[PDB]
């Protein structure tokens, strides 16, 4: 689709069989999901935001479906206020910003 | 233009004759720039995201040119780590997300 920015660009994503709401976010380098359990190996990382830094767990090569499109890539999990699809996954599903 | 997301979508802005570099951020409701003296009355505001909240000064009716497009609106000014164009102004320049 083409998505207006008059409202937040929220989409439904599916990960590990769960449905979540996530924000398509060109201002995020990575995809960051609210605290949740994922299988497999992970590494701790610190990420920065508008207000400071948070601790996250980095999981690699995780399948996710984003508003119809299969992607497989890295997911950070931690105390984000909203689920965020960042540029790493936006590029995988073919998303551009157009004006 | 059609902006791909392989790298951060950083653009030149012009505001009161000053050239700055800013990030096109579909995950920001509002535009927030690094401290700058702007003309007119301002009100204190708190804006939040990953890492918590920061205090800013809200100015209104501020003209700003983003990649050749003219806008006018609310600009927040504060200790953001990076200059951020949010949806308020991305809408004015006609921006959509496309995939």
């Amino acid at each position: 689709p083409q998505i207006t920015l008059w409202k937040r660009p929220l989409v439904t994503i599916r990960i590990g069989g769960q449905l979540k709401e996530a924000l398509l976010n060109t201002g995020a380098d990575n995809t960051v999901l609210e605290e949740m359990n994922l299988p497999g190996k992970w590494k701790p990382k610190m990420i920065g935001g508008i207000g400071g830094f948070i601790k996250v767990r980095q999981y690699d090569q995780i399948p996710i479906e984003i508003c119809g499109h299969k992607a497989i890539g890295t997911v950070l999990v931690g105390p984000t206020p909203v689920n965020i699809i960042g540029r790493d996954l936006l590029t995988q599903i073919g998303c551009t910003l157009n004006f | 233009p059609q902006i791909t997301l392989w790298k951060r979508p950083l653009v030149t802005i012009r505001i009161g004759g000053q050239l700055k570099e800013a990030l096109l951020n579909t995950g920001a409701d509002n535009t927030v720039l690094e401290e700058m003296n702007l003309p007119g009355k301002w009100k204190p505001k708190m804006i939040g995201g990953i890492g918590g909240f920061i205090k800013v000064r809200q100015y209104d009716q501020i003209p700003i040119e983003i990649c050749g497009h003219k806008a006018i609106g609310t600009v927040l000014v504060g200790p953001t780590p990076v200059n951020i164009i949010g949806r308020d102004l991305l809408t004015q320049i006609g921006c959509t997300l496309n995939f």
Binding site: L23, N25, G27, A28, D29, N30, V32, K45, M46, I47, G48, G49, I50, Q58, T80, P81, V82, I84, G86 | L23, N25, G27, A28, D29, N30, V32, I47, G48, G49, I50, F53, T80, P81, V82, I84, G86
Partner: peptide, 9 residues
């Protein structure tokens, strides 16, 4: 909250 800027590790 309304500004979801995020910087890689």
């Amino acid at each position: 909250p309304g500004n979801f800027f995020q910087n890689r590790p």
